[PDB]
Amino acid sequence: PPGPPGEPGMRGLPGAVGPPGPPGPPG
Amino acid sequence: PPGPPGEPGMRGLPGAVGPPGPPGPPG
Amino acid sequence: PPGPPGEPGMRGLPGAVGPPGPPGPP
């Protein structure tokens, strides 16, 4: 008889930090 | 016979929110 | 024998864009 299913895969790597925000409002 | 492949892993965790933007344009 | 491990998940979503900067100078 075939063996049991393999272990579930590894969780993926964490996502990249977001881009910096836009410039602020004018002075 | 080796068993069926394991299930795919979970997608990774989302990235952190990005840093704040630069100061706005001068008056 | 146990089957092969599953494939890894893909990379997580990129983070959201950061907040607006501070108001500009006088």
Swiss-Prot record, chains A, B:
Coiled-coil features, chain-numbered ranges: none
Annotated localization: Secreted, Extracellular space, Extracellular matrix, Basement membrane
Low complexity composition-biased segments: 18-26
Protein name: 120 kDa linear IgA disease antigen
Organism: Homo sapiens (Human)
Lineage: Eukaryota, Metazoa, Chordata, Craniata, Vertebrata
From-to range in the entire protein, with total length: 717 to 749 of 1497
